[PDB]
Design a protein around this ligand. Structure first.
Ligand SMILES: NC(=O)c1ccc[n+]([C@@H]2O[C@H](COP(=O)([O-])OP(=O)(O)OC[C@H]3O[C@@H](n4cnc5c(N)ncnc54)[C@H](O)[C@@H]3O)[C@@H](O)[C@H]2O)c1
Ligand SMILES: NC(=O)c1ccc[n+]([C@@H]2O[C@H](COP(=O)([O-])OP(=O)(O)OC[C@H]3O[C@@H](n4cnc5c(N)ncnc54)[C@H](O)[C@@H]3O)[C@@H](O)[C@H]2O)c1
Ligand SMILES: [Zn+2]
Ligand SMILES: [Zn+2]
Ligand SMILES: [Zn+2]
Ligand SMILES: [Zn+2]
Lengths: 374, 374
């Protein structure tokens, strides 16, 4: 069979920026020492995958994007001790080497072995496991889930429950855990508080779930797309406001509504203006603002340091603050315990082949989470 | 006796920006309901007082500046209950009304009744108690301590120990409490941590005292005036660096020194660039930066939000996070109990009349804190 041999399969390759994904046949080399080869089962389309296409998030091209997924272990390389063939796993785009200063720190989660800070687009050893048309293709965040088969290092994978519905749980690999963690873990939303969430996509709706789970008394959803409002309220939002409905800036509206400003605000979009607006709408003396959105490559925002001096706290976070490998299996166990619902996030389920169409649904605002089944 | 009558005395009035203080005679109206007239015994020269002169911190002119001091209650208006004539007290440039949103929050201290955000330069009732040359003179942060007598609202005054040495504990009215509370209360410095403090002045040296007390293992002091280093070491600094000695940017130097970044960083200067530099040198996934310095009016800083996305926490604070009315008395009691020392901060003591030379000592970089005696 396939073990130890080169496998040929279909992958969605992005050759150029702003071009559609090309469904190609690629050759996936076998797992080297401390690597694992995975058979993909389901993969969600996250806006960050779209940032690569738009040139917003720069990573070496050509590449096989995709990072929000769930699959099954096909083979493991020499030295692997955390997973074995036939094991259901979720690849980790934010690794957990367990040995750097971040992993050793009780709170940091942005492991130094990550490939997001300075994208090399390769494996930990600096080489690629993908070949298409004889040309080496880059990896994306050490995951590359838009492929029937993918190879990831041991530090970038977690073993999860054997009874896990992989087509639902793949959301824990990004969107959900990110939004949920930003609220309960990072911001530390308090019972009775008033929160504001800018952006009601898959990650934004998950922030709303975190806040509701944390006990927030009031949760204001903000989005320029009013069609997103029903789902927001469905998952926990008390009210939703659309900026274009107002003659005066939204931070002013939010300040008046909350009688001085919100307790916690989240930016879950990726725009420089909304990041400052979110900071501004939280209470000046003790408000917390968390940036969840990924900003456009090489751009600086402008803000008045006085917003901070008065007492506000501004933070940012990757993967919702969770140490990936420790937390991923745990969230799956909690999902299984029926502790939270993922369904409201899944709006479309399409075959992997219909990849470009799932992206078209995102860009147009028709979808929240589209899962691609292989 | 002076009770109920207008008092004519000397005060340093600032008529124009960038101009010397004019020590002259002013009339100090008696205290109205819930106001207190105080005789000033000692007052410190904080850099914020110089910001007014330079126009860095905008407050209506002509004004009687000064906000870090100590004195004795001369008379109380109707309804005053928290202080009585003969009490030693410290004027609070940050009030504690106890009724508003911020006062009732367990963490916040920036009282809504403050005159720092929207400076009117008057009493809580919109009127002034100062007259010079027939012309009304403005108050500053509701304290105006550069006067032999001053009137403050009850919410802006705290009674301290009857045995307190006013010429020393006056620094508790601002410089010390600010720097100290920034480390232990705001940034919450941990045992064994590496800290960096930009600005080795009265407030910065006090930050170092807070880090030492919190157990910091390493505390690097940054200043372009190498003369400040000896006193820094003396109060806690393990090492000191002068950005001018290096060919490469200090955030790089500091990052390499602490093997990937400091745990906590403090900007205690008031410059836009050092605020950004301070954030950048703390560890990217769990570093915490605290802005203590007062920035130039209406000037915005430019920064890359990725600095925060990776996991950094950015916050600022007024008066070290201390609820003024609550904290001040306890801090004076601890001083008495010898829990901390104020002496290393005091480098020059001058009679009030020498106020102008005191400010020149601050500008020449020769002093830390000059106490002015009445
Ligand atoms: N920090 C992390 O670990 C992490 C993880 C996942 C995703 N992200 C980033 O988080 C962001 C959200 O991803 P998502 O998958 O939920 O995206 P999404 O595209 O599904 O949702 C974005 C939403 O924000 C809205 N919006 C756009 N402009 C707006 C504006 N000007 N004002 C108000 N609302 C506006 C859109 O209508 C949309 O509903 C992206 O930038 C993604 O790259 C970060
Ligand atoms: N947030 C608050 O509640 C609060 C309270 C008190 C004072 N402050 C502010 O804190 C700041 C410091 O006050 P201070 O009284 O200690 O002032 P200070 O003038 O005594 O100290 C400033 C120090 O920074 C140094 N410095 C200047 N430029 C530098 C540079 N480019 N790089 C590194 N170091 C540099 C100066 O040499 C000096 O030693 C001020 O801006 C003041 O207004 C804020
Ligand atoms: Zn994602
Ligand atoms: Zn690590
Ligand atoms: Zn001051
Ligand atoms: Zn108050």
């Amino acid at each position: 069979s396939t073990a130890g041999k080169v496998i040929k399969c279909k992958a969605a390759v992005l050759w150029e920026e702003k071009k559609p994904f090309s469904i190609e046949e690629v050759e996936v080399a076998p797992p080297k020492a401390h690597e694992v080869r995975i058979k993909m089962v389901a993969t969600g389309i996250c806006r960050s995958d779209d940032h690569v296409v738009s040139g917003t998030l720069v990573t070496p091209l050509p590449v096989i994007a995709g990072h929000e997924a769930a699959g099954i272990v096909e083979s493991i390389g020499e030295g692997v001790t955390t997973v074995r063939p036939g094991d259901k796993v979720i690849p980790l785009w934010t690794p957990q080497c367990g040995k750097c200063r971040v992993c050793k720190h009780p709170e940091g989660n942005f492991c130094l072995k990550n490939d997001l800070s300075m994208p090399r687009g390769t494996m930990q050893d600096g080489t690629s496991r993908f070949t298409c048309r004889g040309k080496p293709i880059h990896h994306f965040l050490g995951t590359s889930t838009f492929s029937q088969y993918t190879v990831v290092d041991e530090i970038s994978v977690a073993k999860i429950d054997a009874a896990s519905p992989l087509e639902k749980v793949c959301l824990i690999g990004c969107g959900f855990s990110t939004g949920y963690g930003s609220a309960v873990k990072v911001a530390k939303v308090t019972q009775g508080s008033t929160c504001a969430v800018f952006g009601l996509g898959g990650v934004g709706l998950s922030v709303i779930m975190g806040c509701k789970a944390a006990g927030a008394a009031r949760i204001i959803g903000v989005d320029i797309n009013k069609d997103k409002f029903a789902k927001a309220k469905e998952v926990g939002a008390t009210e939703c406001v659309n900026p274009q409905d107002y003659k005066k800036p939204i931070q002013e509206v939010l300040t008046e509504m909350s009688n001085g400003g919100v307790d916690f605000s989240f930016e879950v979009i990726g725009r420089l203006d909304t990041m400052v607006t979110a900071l501004s709408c939280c209470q000046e003396a003790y408000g917390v603002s968390v940036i969840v959105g990924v900003p456009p490559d090489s751009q600086n925002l402008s803000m008045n340091p006085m917003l901070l001096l008065s007492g506000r706290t501004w933070k940012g976070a990757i993967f919702g603050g969770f140490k990936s490998k420790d937390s991923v299996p745990k969230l799956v166990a909690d999902f299984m315990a029926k502790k939270f619902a993922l369904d409201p996030l899944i709006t479309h389920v399409l075959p992997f082949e219909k990849i470009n169409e799932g992206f078209d649904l995102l860009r147009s605002g028709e979808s929240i989470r589209t899962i691609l089944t292989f």
